[PDB]
């Protein structure tokens, strides 16, 4: 009856918002391209507070964190490439032959032995030097004259070889007065009201692994194998499936490579591919045919929940596009693999040893956003072999169903890890009536 | 006892959450947010630092122009206009949560913030007129 306004400072109420999210990382110390040394050390006690009775609305497809990580990663690469060697003198006419012929017909042109004139430390004196280049990095002229793949579109820079491409777990954190909300629902769709909710000062460790088709080294579901898309009934919206069991994939570039330093100027050094010690073999990836068949069936079972227990779905290989999107392209040991994937999506399923993936290698990779910039990955010495799990996929429907892979948008990778998070802002001020009066 | 943690009583009743206000009060400025390098992570952190102190003082400023400086629970002289919410006390403090309460009182939140502002400008004018003897 006698009710006055009563002010409360520190009430558990929040609203959705967008904010700058800073990074955290664990102590490990060279320097990676992700600059995780320049982040605040993560707490050895990642405090997670459970929000009893709370139910929040989530929407991983309007989430702002993925739009910020997609830009942070790109800013991390541009920052790390700035002080490295510009390779504009390499955009010069190349005299190329095949390296060590007589193996398997049109697989000796897969990599070339190329010699060219080049600037020295003295601006007036030239040098004829030779290097090995993969076929995916050169084009003809129309004689045995070639040129770098990028010289008509982009300028080129080689990554400083002291920088590591190895992904390091990154923790995104909300500033003081903000919050991260986790959806602890073990069968969460990515959108809609989530029953179990917890708040965290920082997200879990997220390795910024940029892969195609197959999601690598990612986080796993705890039950079933979820499938996430905004409009699944729309064939133009990518399907982000996520396994609960990790299907292991082994990759290797078996050629024992040599890095030969070349002085292209005062203090400027281009790292050419010298020669190959031992056999000239084929880069490839293995994945257990048993586990892949099992895990490919789990996706079929959950794909039925959106298309019917009676319908038939089929897996086919990519339908074209740029090379990065038609193949399982990723980074392994510093070299950029581009793996033909037809041996993984060549299967039709009824209503009710290992397989090997032939991979080619590129060195002059282009930026995925703008045009006019491309990086030269320096050649890695020794033998390369990386071992990782496939934890998800990026599929595409066509409208008997058929599903094929793809997905050249980097933020689809971050969606697969930031789906369970949401950024809100604390509003600790609250007014409410009670029979209390000042003085 | 209980100690639900930071925002732990977000789903609790308004009266129960009104007993754990220091939990959310101390976490409005600390967190984890020593040189200032202007890198992609450095400019990021510097913004996260300045934004936190800004929003903290905006609340403390309103808490000041209402006579509630350094209070978690202050009472005022502004009476409750029933057009804000005709709900009874026992169906608010033992029923609703602070989230849904802010959802329905959000319209008149700017009206209430003005009534408290002049009630404090007039209370301190009366306190001066009383100590003038």
């Amino acid at each position, epitope marked *: 009856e006698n009710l006055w306004v009563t002010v409360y400072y520190g009430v558990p109420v929040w609203k959705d918002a967008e904010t700058t999210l800073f990074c955290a990382s664990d102590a490990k110390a060279k320097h990676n391209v992700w600059a995780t040394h320049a982040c605040v050390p993560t707490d050895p006690n990642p405090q997670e507070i459970h929000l009893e*009775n709370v*139910t*929040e*609305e989530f929407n991983m497809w309007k989430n702002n964190m993925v739009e910020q990580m997609h830009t942070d990663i790109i800013s991390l690469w541009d920052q790390s490439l700035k002080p490295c060697v510009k390779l504009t003198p390499l955009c010069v006419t190349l005299q190329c032959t095949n390296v060590t012929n007589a193996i398997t017909d049109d697989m000796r042109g897969e990599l070339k032995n190329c010699s060219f004139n080049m600037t020295t430390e003295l601006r007036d004196k030239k040098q004829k030097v030779y290097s090995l280049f993969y076929r995916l990095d050169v084009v003809q002229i129309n004689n045995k004259e070639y040129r770098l793949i990028n010289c008509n579109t982009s300028a080129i820079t080689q990554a400083c070889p002291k920088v590591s491409f190895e992904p390091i777990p990154i923790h995104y954190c909300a500033p003081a007065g903000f919050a991260i909300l986790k959806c602890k629902d073990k069968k969460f769709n990515g959108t*809609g*009201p*989530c*029953p179990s909710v917890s708040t965290v000062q920082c997200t879990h460790g997220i390795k910024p692994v940029v892969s195609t088709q197959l999601l690598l080294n990612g986080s796993l579901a705890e039950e079933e194998v979820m499938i996430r898309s905004e409009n699944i009934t729309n064939n133009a919206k990518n399907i982000l499936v996520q396994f609960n069991t990790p299907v292991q994939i082994n990759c290797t570039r078996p050629n024992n490579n040599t890095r030969k330093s070349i002085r292209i100027g005062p203090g400027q050094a281009f790292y050419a591919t010298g020669d190959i010690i031992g056999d000239i073999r084929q880069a490839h990836c293995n994945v257990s045919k048993a586990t892949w068949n099992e895990t490919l069936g789990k996706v079929v079972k959950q794909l039925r929940k959106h298309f019917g227990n009676n319908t038939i779905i089929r897996f086919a290989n990519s339908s074209g596009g740029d090379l990065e999107v038609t193949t399982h392209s990723f980074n392994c040991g510093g070299e950029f693999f581009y793996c033909n994937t037809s041996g993984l999506f060549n299967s039709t399923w009824i209503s009710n040893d290992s397989i090997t993936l032939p991979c080619r290698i590129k060195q002059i990779i282009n930026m995925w956003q703008r045009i006019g910039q491309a990086m030269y990955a320096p050649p890695i010495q020794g033998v390369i072999r990386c071992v990782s799990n496939i934890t998800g996929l990026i599929l595409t429907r066509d409208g008997t169903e058929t599903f094929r892979p793809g997905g050249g948008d980097m933020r689809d990778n971050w969606r697969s890890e930031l789906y369970k998070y949401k950024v809100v802002k604390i509003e600790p001020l609250g007014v409410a009536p009670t029979r209390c009066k000042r003085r | 006892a209980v100690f639900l943690g930071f925002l732990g009583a977000a789903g609790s*009743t308004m*009266g*129960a959450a009104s007993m754990t206000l220091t939990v959310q009060a101390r976490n409005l400025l600390s967190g984890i947010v020593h040189l200032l390098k202007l890198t992609v992570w450095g400019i990021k952190q510097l913004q996260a630092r300045v934004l936190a102190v800004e929003r903290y003082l905006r609340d403390q400023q309103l808490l000041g122009i209402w006579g509630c400086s350094g209070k978690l629970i202050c009472c005022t002289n502004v009476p409750w206009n029933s057009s804000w919410s005709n709900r009874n006390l*026992s*169906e608010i403090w*033992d*029923n609703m949560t602070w*989230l*849904q309460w802010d959802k329905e009182i959000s319209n008149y939140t700017q009206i209430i913030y003005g009534l408290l502002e002049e009630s404090q400008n007039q209370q301190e004018k009366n306190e001066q007129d009383l100590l003038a003897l």
Partner: nanobody
Framework: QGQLVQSGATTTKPGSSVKISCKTS????????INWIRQTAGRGPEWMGW????????????????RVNMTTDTEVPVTSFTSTGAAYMEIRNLTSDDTGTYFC????????????????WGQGTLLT
């Protein structure tokens, strides 16, 4: 708001055991108890008992102590404050003297001295 749709009004004969359903909407099913009330024709209205859709803790009158099974399943979130739930009612050593209209009613408040009080009722169901 709040709605509590009840089951059908079908009838059986003594010795049996029937199940009464109560489906809720427009409110958080877990935040209030679920009561079962009986309006017999040859007796004053009787409170049978309430149950917690959150804590699972049930409490019945000693007249129904070992003759009634009360169960509720978990809710389905619709919005941040709206869910859908269900409550079930059973009788064991049943006769024809337990005839009347049966209601389901949710609790009043979430805390205090009148937490479980039957505040929002269903349309009732006719029995044998």
């Amino acid at each position: 708001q709040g709605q509590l749709v009840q089951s059908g009004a079908t009838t059986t004969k003594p010795g049996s055991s029937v199940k009464i359903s109560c489906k809720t909407s427009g409110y958080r099913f877990n935040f209030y108890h679920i009561n079962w009330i009986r309006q017999t024709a040859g007796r004053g209205p009787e409170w049978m008992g309430w149950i917690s859709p959150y804590s699972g803790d049930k409490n019945l009158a000693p007249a129904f102590q070992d003759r009634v099974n009360m169960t509720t399943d978990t809710e389905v979130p619709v919005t941040s404050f709206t869910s859908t739930g269900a409550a079930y009612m059973e009788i064991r050593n049943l006769t024809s003297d337990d005839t009347g209209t049966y209601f389901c009613a949710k609790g009043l408040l979430r805390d205090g001295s009148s937490t479980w009080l039957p505040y929002l009722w269903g349309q009732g169901t006719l029995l044998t």
